[PDB]
Write a protein that binds this ligand. Structure first.
Ligand code: JV1
Length: 241
């Protein structure tokens, strides 16, 4: 079973209020390096692993890079390079008794590979995972950390280079990414000649560092963070170590 969000957020937030404007885990030792999935539909493994890596960095100040390949090979609830679910991934991490660091189990993508849970002496596990309600993404980011989220990607998304992306959404939820924070940029309109506050979510994508902004993409949101473009965060899970 998963955990109750309201019971967990009471524990990590308390009564403490926060700034809805800008916050980014990359600046507070909460975001591990950007990785790549070449010719493989294993985003589900990159998105969930990365969230675990983040929790070790946040809760234990332990930078550990874990094996997506072990998840691709050994996650039996999911279909490696054919697609999977973030929650099933977390269920299988618990069942497997954790994952080997990617130093002991490297990523070989679509290349055929067999599952071997004994590639290392010490595995890195999780206690459980939590489902984040679509209206509490900004609060969950701020007090719990980076979230494994689903998103609907369009071909325009693959052509993203910099700034904030909007209005080019996929037909269905096809990709798994990590929500690493939120921000705001005040921009004076060239027409009205008046200043406007432009809020955005900061997302970590597993398409290498050559993609977008150092492997990251900023997506338009509002001050509240209720605005979820391309169904971002429809599926929102955060592991707890
Ligand atoms: O795994 C993918 C490829 C992503 C990708 C990699 C490099 C790129 C790119 C997209 O655009 C430019 O360079 C990918 C993602 C979503 C859907 C499908 N699919 O055809 O079923 C493949």
């Amino acid at each position: 079973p998963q955990m109750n969000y309201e019971e967990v957020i009471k524990k990590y937030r308390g009564e403490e209020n926060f700034d809805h404007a800008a916050y980014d885990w990359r600046l507070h030792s909460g975001v591990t390096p950007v990785k790549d999935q070449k010719n493989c539909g294993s985003a589900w493994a990159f998105s969930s692993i990365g969230s675990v890596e983040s929790q070790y960095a946040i809760r234990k100040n332990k930078l550990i890079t874990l094996s997506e390949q072990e998840l691709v090979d050994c996650s039996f609830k999911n279909y490696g390079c054919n697609g999977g679910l973030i929650n099933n991934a977390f269920e299988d991490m618990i069942e497997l008794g954790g994952i080997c660091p990617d130093g002991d189990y490297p990523y070989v993508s679509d290349a055929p590979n067999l599952c071997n849970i004994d590639r290392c002496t010490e595995k890195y596990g999780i206690k459980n995972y939590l489902s984040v309600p679509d209206n509490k993404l900004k609060e969950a980011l701020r007090f719990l950390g980076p979230i494994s989220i689903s998103v609907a990607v369009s071909d325009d998304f693959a052509f993203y280079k910099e700034g904030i992306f909007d209005g080019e959404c996929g037909d269905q939820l096809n990709h798994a990414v990590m929500l690493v924070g939120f921000g705001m940029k005040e921009i004076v309109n060239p027409l009205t000649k008046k200043g406007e506050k432009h809020y955005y979510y900061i997302i970590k994508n597993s398409w290498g560092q050559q993609w977008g902004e150092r492997g990251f993409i900023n997506i338009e949101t509002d001050e509240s963070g209720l605005m979820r473009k391309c169904g971002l965060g429809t599926d929102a899970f955060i592991p707890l170590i």
